[PDB]
Every structure is written in structure tokens, then in C-alpha cells.
């Protein structure tokens, strides 16, 4: 994993490269307007300590922050997401605290509405691999990184509501 952040658009200005997690990038650069992901899967954060808007990025060139659906040009923490080989698995629930009907998911899901007739998920259990949760169908809207573990309520994956449109396994190309 290598991501290099650039302060200005079109890969110009002061830059910084990371190969690992960083809870606070503020000491390294004051703004971020373009990015070059050389390798790995990354989750970028608007605020330090992995808070605020989250953005999922894979290898590629990003000449401006709009390219990664950035809210603004603030990137203050990043996570290198560990590659998972084999099966990705998670369970979603009707109600919070793992109650109501449960469905198990093991592939990408561009529309929960379409496949489960659900617009909201009130709790989920990530058993294997890392996933990205999207507020809206077809991987649009606010993004939330799901690492393996228990999410007894939507608040646990850092969202403001239980609206869940799509789900994507964190896989490299």
C-alpha cells in the first residue's frame, strides 16, 4: 500500500506518502486536492482519528477531490485496509441488537431494496473480510467502512441513520 497525497489539483504542490494507517495527517499536509494510489485499498477520513466523511479509494489517479466523492479538500486520517482472501461474510438484521429477520450476505450488493426489499438495516455482524456500506443504491451517498466485528446499531458504523442502499466487499483488482 502507497497513497500519496497532494495539496493542490493535478498532482501539484507539497505532497506526502503513506504505507500504513495514520490517525492524524495534519502535521504532514494542510489540504488535499489530488491523490495517487499506487497500491492497496484505502479508507480516507475527513477528520483525525478516523472520523467524519469516509472515502474508499483503490489504485488509480485522482486529479481532484471530486474524483473520490470528497466533501471538501480535508483528509486528516487514513486506513490501509487489510486484504482478505476467500469468502466475505456478514449478516444483516431487521432490528437493532441483532433482532428481527436475519439475512447473510457474501457478495457485492448494489441494491438491498432490490434483493431484500429493505431500505434500512438496524444492526449487522461482519464475520469475514472488510466491507464498505453505502447510504444509497449502486454505491452512492455516504460511505462507511465495516471491519469484522459487531455493529449492534447503525451508530456503531459512524452513520446518522439506518439507511443502507448497497454493500461492497473490500477487494483489490
Swiss-Prot record:
Gene3D superfamilies: Crystallins. GO terms for biological process: lens development in camera-type eye; visual perception. The keyword Cytoplasm does not apply. Residues 1-39, 40-82, 88-128, 129-171 form the Beta/gamma crystallin 'Greek key' domain. GO terms for molecular function: structural constituent of eye lens. Disulfide bonds join 18-22. Coiled coil: none annotated. InterPro entries: Beta/Gamma-Crystallin (IPR050252), Beta/gamma_crystallin (IPR001064), G_crystallin-like (IPR011024). It comes from the Eukaryota. Keywords: Disulfide bond, Eye lens protein, Glycation, Glycoprotein, Repeat. Glycans are attached at residue 2. Residues 83-87 are annotated as: Connecting peptide. Crystallins are the dominant structural components of the vertebrate eye lens. Belongs to the beta/gamma-crystallin family. Has a two-domain beta-structure, folded into four very similar Greek key motifs. This is Gamma-crystallin B. It comes from Bos taurus. The lineage of its organism: Eukaryota, Metazoa, Chordata, Craniata, Vertebrata. The gene is CRYGB.
Amino acid at each position: 500500500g502507497k497513497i500519496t497525497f497532494y495539496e493542490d489539483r493535478g498532482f501539484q504542490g507539497h505532497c506526502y506518502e503513506s504505507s500504513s494507517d495514520c490517525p492524524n495527517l495534519q502535521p504532514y499536509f494542510s489540504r488535499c486536492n489530488s491523490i495517487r494510489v499506487d497500491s492497496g485499498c484505502w479508507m480516507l477520513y475527513e477528520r483525525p482519528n478516523y472520523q467524519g466523511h469516509q472515502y474508499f479509494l483503490r489504485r488509480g489517479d485522482y486529479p481532484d477531490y471530486q474524483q473520490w466523492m470528497g466533501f471538501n479538500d480535508s483528509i486528516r486520517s487514513c486506513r490501509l485496509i487489510p486484504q482478505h482472501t476467500g469468502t466475505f461474510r456478514m449478516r444483516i438484521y431487521e432490528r437493532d441488537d441483532f433482532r428481527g429477520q436475519m439475512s447473510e450476505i457474501t457478495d457485492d450488493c448494489p441494491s438491498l431494496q432490490d434483493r431484500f426489499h429493505l431500505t434500512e438495516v438496524h444492526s449487522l455482524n461482519v464475520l469475514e473480510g472488510s466491507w464498505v456500506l453505502y447510504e444509497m443504491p449502486s454505491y452512492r451517498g455516504r460511505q462507511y467502512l465495516l471491519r469484522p466485528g459487531e455493529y449492534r446499531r447503525y451508530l456503531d458504523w459512524g452513520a446518522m441513520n439506518a439507511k443502507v442502499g448497497s454493500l461492497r466487499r473490500v477487494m483489490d483488482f
